[PDB]
Design a protein around this ligand. Structure first.
Ligand code: FAD
Ligand code: FAD
Ligand code: FAD
Ligand code: TDL
Ligand code: TDL
Ligand code: TDL
Ligand code: MG
Ligand code: MG
Ligand code: MG
Ligand code: NA
Lengths: 585, 585, 585
């Protein structure tokens, strides 16, 4: 006959298949809390220790599963705490619903306690941003919010006056539209455009295929096209793992979270096939200034010819289009361009392996990641924070299509390691989950290590303790006239932090310590979370964007200094391999 | 070697195929003006007399052609005057680019003359909203604005500090992505879903097909499905004309800008096929409260199950899906439901004809519209203002797929009549164009009758002068307890207004005056604009949402009063026709 | 026992002393209309023909009387039409309450007709910006809005769902805080600071007192300080009339809406007393680049040292501080600086008189303004539009403390002439009221000439018809490389426009026609509005910011061209007068 409006709201969430949601209660959201409390069997409330972690974990849920993440915050400070997670969801274009507490409608606009007009707070971040003002339409407003968040791939925010969810509404009127939800059936890729794009790619002397995460369903086709046509592959950083890292012609990514071969090869390429890619450094880094023909495949019209003047842009699904290309091409014999890139990749991997394979001495980030590799299951998920770890994990993690890795790709909020791992373990209780975080990032969300303990989420946390914002210190080295500032700080012993939240932990500062500590951690994480605090050196990782290796481009003194600093004595510039196989710059 | 950034910006507009744009100059936008001035042979600046008319005409350009409309306003009050046209573009989801003047970067944030932070002004209306801060990237920002406005079917606003377009930039770096433009992919109907939909539709006892402008490409399929299956058709008001008005099973539209047979049939229907339709009155009017099964076809996932819980929902193009249904059905015999509706339509149309066919006496809106019909070419375009005219034009205009009509569908801003006709005549100089406007709406944008004169745009302007806001008077009649207020006002003689802007004009107040005046207007408008000021009675048009004709539902006295007031003695309720064919109400 | 919330809201407006308010009704605001209708004996609704005129008139009410202006617009386009008047109120810092219609709370967030989240629309313009959600608190929210608009000298906006004002609330709980209202405290000048200020001012070789409207209560003190100390006076344009224009050491205003002696003297001054002044051109025009000492008196701490570094700054009321200075000084002898400026003023005024005193020939703006002077009562009020008219009225109107004049000072929105005069005549039915407007600005709000007729408001409207946006043509002349664009347009005959709204009118195009036409207008306006359409030449008024008269600074040829164009053969540069009295430039 009647149902509480709050109970109907929870039933809307359940209809859309929301498994878990995050937040911290307050008087202004206690009626939504009351409805969740009656529904503990069907929907799992996760009490976090800071609301930003709830918002970042909701974004991560959607990154991992493609299903909407849900978080909430009480009126005022609860909701404003969500912001770093909500901006992450907006910039990484994933569906998130955020519920915001509000004072009851009888007290709104009275300038009462923690009471303000909350609608303008969320106007910028949100695709949909409304204050509910009626109980009977509240389930519809929640359903609308969800449907829009999915359709528009972003954040829907609903401010809820706390009186509304306690009002009775007719039991028979409300519904959810989850039952209507589907994905579109697309026509086949434009045949004549695909044929023309293929001819241009094949006519090139120095082709590259450069994909981003829009190509996530197309790993098989990418690797087969590469092998068949003898065309090296490079990707955006987040697209690492779509093609296995072990693939001999995967060059890595460009710019700074980057690998030497991709940077060098891109500078030489005459034709680039840019697929499912919205690389934000295209223009500012002049990435394609030497490219003769630029070909694109993207599913979004707003991206067509966005990043560079484009000769042919096909509006289509990446996988369907790459399959259609593969269907019209056949074997090409090895070329000097292919052989030069393969040799360059081999030389680069030997460099990385030399860093990883040190067996004793002062601990560096490189041996830490090798120790991760050694205990990693083939389908492990990595939640990665923001800083040098993106660069180091990008180079050292050995990923395949069976893995997932997530970070804050574009907003790049520090603190995401812990919440992304919480979300990963909640969605995939049977998969191994790592949190790889620098000390600056880990410290911003450290309190929510307690959330892993409280919910028995067996995350393997690895904190990279350099006592620096290393990423920023290296930037200051490059740009700043005056001394380093704000980038070197006091130690925090995260093994003691972990102990304080009742999580087993280790602290290591020597390479020879790694094998046994990581073996213990692997075993602990069969049942409980664990943390390893790795005390690492302040060595700057090799800057792929500032290579000094080529005699024709850099002075002998600069090359000598670069080789010394970066332990890079055995690295050769691409030009050495180009010359070897009969090509010039 | 170099080009002025302003010249490059105009070249971007040209590459995107912008033929004409609107605005009023100011110091804060004179560098864009300077670039326009050099380009006057390739792109055509239309100087309006109020910037809202420029924004409304830009919206109407896009409604009519699907090509982005372009407008501008100077810093401060120029831009703020755009708002009603920009909101019209957002709510009617058509692409519009708005350029806003701003003080030079050397004077921004100094609190100088007409200088303010302009970005927050446009944040709500705009899909994309940026202040340009660099000359070299300015062409890209404009390119970005256009590509987004198209992809997202909405408003892009760029605030341009006046110094930037007078700066030299490299001639060879800037580009437009117009060459890469594509319209969004059209998703295909799932065959099994279409089969299930077809079976539910065929099993219905009282089916209706209820379409909106999303079905504008599917008029043939809608009419053929209706004839073949013996299923009546109804539409949203804006979808009038997709199927010819003369089609005998076209019921009209529901709610208030509505036709009696559509409201009556919808209340009785057991199954609705809701296609390309976002009827905003669905929930508030409880349109579908007694509908057993609800079948939806829409291209936009945000719409699926939005207006009612769906039994079958198809995420696909309207014409593809309707063709798929038509392909799997064959001729059905007549049914009681079908005959009942056909008879109801005949009775209704005879009513409207009786109004139109009066030959002498006090002029009413009905005969004015008959006089429009009599001079209207088969492919005439109608720009319609907001008020009683929407209801009257909806009932009386005899439209076919060959016509176009536009109004402000959802924001419903008064004043659009004049600008929409300006845009119509610019886009279709060889087609007859009407502006049909009430006196309230015509008053709001009356100065831009001067723009039709200045640009020699032969619009036939027809003003319905009731000396009222009739639409609002009728609402106050229905809801207010106290006397009418603000709805009856002083006469404006629009023939004298027209004389003042140097436009030929006539004023009529008797039915017998119409044939000769309209013939003269038809002739004048072969070369120049003309205005007819029609002084009409204050008769209220029949409220299709408040019918008093059925003695099972209304008192004898209310029926009698309704018949007398609305000259509706010969109208019968649908129940009469339902009973004739053996169906109960 | 109970009262309708809408009735209580109107009672709040009455308690606050609101005599009249403006707007246009709509369904979304009909419950406020219903309450107004019952209260028509105590509060007076003015129905305008476009809501921007209602907002601009509300702003002008507050400019004229200091009492909050009140306007409203229906949901969506009604409210958005308010924007230019609301921005005018914000930038001119006057209290205005705007009520915005909204759909009932049962239909909000359902995406129904003309229904949207309206709160973000007003967030930028408004000091206070809330959507009401409860009937019982609605009177308080309106009370809060008014008290804030006053205290903060800005715009308060309340969006009101239409259901709320038709709800019953307890008769005894609501109140207005009008009874508790007070204006902000007037801070007192520090005696030692005033002494230091006085000594710096007296030690100056070339002193100026430069005041704005913050000194509107201190005209007597300004004129007496000037006479006693032999210090010339200059003002912002809006501060014209605070000291009678006939005062022989009044230099006028600087920059462009400016008088030659003010620009010349300011460039030479060593000490400026800057009082009640927020001149927005100070930094951008480098007004004070050669000023040795800068002395400031202002009531607002946000202004102190804003426009230039301060040597002495006094946070105090202008009149109290000026009286304190005057109290500690005595008569000073004449100085070379004083005589030089007095002679410069005489030469300038003889120039303006030579323009005014033409008796026959092609009509220019100058003689029109002389004709206004000749029929103007000593306490006439001038509502001035935006464009050349600001410059011309600034030079030619002969104002005293008995006059008022208003325009849009800082937002500078065109169209204010008509509404400002409507507001003037409502507030001062016994005072003569002029609307002085260019053709561009008069065009924008021309429909509301009907409002002067409807309410029998005997405004003397004077339109300056140059068939140009003259102000902008002159800017393009100064800055643009290519031909003029968008600044010359087609004639509108405003006497025919006037005839169309049933207002008596005249059109003149010769100097000799003025005396009789203006005498007739003076007489007509004893009882009814009247319009004079003055067809004027396209002569550019003398640019006080681009003087070419001094042979030490300009070529002989530029001087000759300047004299001929501006009929300025008898003008001398200030250096002539400086040299006469033994001072060098
Ligand atoms: C500290 C830090 C530093 C970083 N620096 C770098 C760096 O140096 N190098 C680097 O590479 N990255 C770097 N990034 C990541 C970077 O900011 C961008 O997020 C990333 O490069 C963009 O990757 P993308 O194009 O794969 O993803 P997105 O930006 O999400 O783009 C996806 C694209 O694919 C399209 N798409 C989606 N689905 C389909 C489909 N089915 N078919 C076709 N197209 C589809 C979309 O329309 C879009 O254009 C860094 C991140 C961090 C945290
Ligand atoms: C004064 C006034 C009063 C009004 N009152 C009424 C009234 O009483 N009755 C009335 O009917 N209207 C009325 N309106 C118009 C009304 O507000 C709505 O705008 C209208 O009913 C919605 O029409 P629609 O669904 O055709 O258009 P839209 O709202 O534009 O929706 C079109 C739909 O089609 C979908 N679509 C687009 N392309 C495709 C495709 N290729 N295939 C499938 N789907 C597609 C879109 O996703 C969208 O859902 C009034 C207007 C005015 C000015
Ligand atoms: C088309 C056009 C062009 C214009 N160009 C010019 C131009 O060339 N030249 C020009 O002069 N103007 C021009 N303006 C007007 C200009 O934009 C500014 O509005 C004006 O110069 C500022 O005047 P003001 O300082 O008197 O007023 P405001 O900006 O309102 O400032 C008043 C000051 O007085 C202070 N105050 C208030 N009360 C007191 C008190 N009791 N005691 C002490 N201080 C107090 C306030 O805090 C404030 O600082 C133009 C206007 C238009 C429409
Ligand atoms: C919340 C927050 N605060 C600051 C930053 C800036 N910021 C970064 C970037 C990528 O945005 C950047 O500026 O280049 S990276 C970074 C340092 C990360 O320090 P960590 O100790 O976590 O990582 P290491 O680099 O391994 O030392 C900071 C502070 C950020 N990204 N997020
Ligand atoms: C710019 C503006 N201002 C006010 C309105 C409100 N409004 C209308 C609706 C549909 O929005 C409504 O409220 O129902 S309809 C309307 C009256 C239009 O009066 P007209 O004289 O033009 O038409 P008639 O109804 O033929 O008299 C007004 C003022 C509006 N739509 N746009
Ligand atoms: C609503 C609106 N639109 C445009 C403008 C720009 N604008 C002006 C300024 C002061 O803002 C300026 O840019 O310098 S002045 C101006 C011209 C006014 O032309 P008129 O015909 O009314 O006056 P004359 O100068 O006498 O011809 C315009 C269009 C403006 N102020 N307000
Ligand atoms: Mg660190
Ligand atoms: Mg009317
Ligand atoms: Mg003019
Ligand atoms: Na107007």
């Amino acid at each position: 006959t009647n149902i509480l409006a709050g109970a109907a709201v929870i039933k809307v969430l359940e209809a859309w298949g929301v498994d878990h949601l995050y937040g911290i209660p307050g008087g202004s959201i206690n009626s939504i809390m009351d409805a969740l409390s009656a529904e503990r069997d069907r929907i799992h409330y996760i009490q976090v220790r800071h609301e930003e972690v709830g918002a970042m974990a909701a974004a991560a849920d959607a990154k991992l599963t493609g299903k909407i993440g849900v978080c909430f915050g009480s009126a005022g400070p609860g909701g404003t705490h969500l912001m770093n997670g909500l901006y992450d969801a907006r910039e990484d274009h994933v569906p998130v619903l955020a519920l915001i507490g509000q004072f009851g409608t009888t007290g709104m606009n009275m300038d009462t306690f923690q009471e303000m007009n909350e609608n303008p707070i969320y106007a910028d971040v949100a695709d949909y941003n409304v204050t509910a003002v009626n109980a009977a339409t509240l389930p519809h407003v929640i359903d609308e919010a969800i449907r829009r968040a999915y359709a528009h791939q972003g954040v829907a925010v609903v401010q809820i006056p706390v009186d509304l969810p306690w009002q009775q509404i007719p039991a028979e009127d409300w519904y959810a539209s989850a039952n209507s939800y589907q994905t579109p059936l697309l026509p086949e890729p434009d045949v004549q455009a695909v044929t023309r794009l293929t001819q241009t790619l094949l006519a090139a002397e120095r082709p590259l295929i450069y994909y981003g995460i829009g190509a996530r369903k197309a790993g098989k086709e990418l690797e087969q096209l590469s092998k068949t046509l003898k065309i090296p592959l490079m990707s955006t950083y987040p697209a690492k793992g779509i093609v296995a890292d072990r693939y001999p012609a995967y060059l890595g990514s460009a710019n700074r979270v980057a690998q030497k071969p991709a940077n060098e090869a891109l500078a030489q390429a005459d034709v680039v096939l840019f697929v499912g890619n919205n690389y934000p450094f295209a223009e500012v880094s002049k990435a394609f200034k030497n490219t003769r023909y630029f070909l694109q495949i993207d599913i979004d019209p707003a991206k067509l010819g966005k990043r560079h003047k484009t000769d042919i842009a096909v509006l289509a699904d990446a996988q369907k289009t790459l399959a259609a290309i593969l269907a019209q091409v056949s074997e090409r014999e090895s070329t000097p361009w292919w052989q030069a890139n393969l040799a360059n990749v081999k030389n680069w991997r030997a460099y990385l392996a030399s860093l990883e394979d040190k067996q004793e001495g002062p601990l560096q980030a490189y041996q830490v990641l090798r120790a991760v590799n050694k205990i990693a299951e083939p389908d492990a998920i990595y939640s990665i924070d923001v800083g040098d770890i993106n660069l180091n994990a990008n180079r050292h993690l050995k990923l395949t299509p069976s893995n997932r890795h997530i970070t804050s790709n574009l907003f790049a909020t520090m603190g995401v390691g812990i919440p992304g791992a919480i979300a990963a373990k909640l969605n995939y209780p049977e998969r191994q989950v790592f949190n790889l975080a620098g000390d600056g990032g880990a410290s911003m969300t450290m309190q929510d290590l307690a959330t892993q303990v409280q919910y028995h989420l067996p995350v393997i946390n690895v904190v990279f303790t350099n006592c620096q914002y290393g990423w920023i210190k290296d930037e200051q080295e490059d740009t700043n006239q005056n001394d380093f500032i704000g980038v070197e700080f006091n130690d925090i012993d995260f093994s003691k932090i972990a102990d304080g939240v009742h999580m087993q932990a280790f602290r290591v500062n020597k390479i020879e310590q790694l094998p046994d500590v990581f073996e213990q951690a692997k075993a602990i994480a069969q049942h409980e979370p664990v943390l390893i605090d790795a005390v690492i050196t302040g060595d700057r990782p090799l800057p792929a964007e500032k290579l000094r290796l080529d005699s024709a481009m850099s002075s002998a003194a600069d090359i000598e200094a670069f080789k010394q600093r970066y332990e890079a004595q055995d690295l050769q510039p691409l030009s050495t391999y180009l010359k070897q196989f009969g090509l010039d710059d």
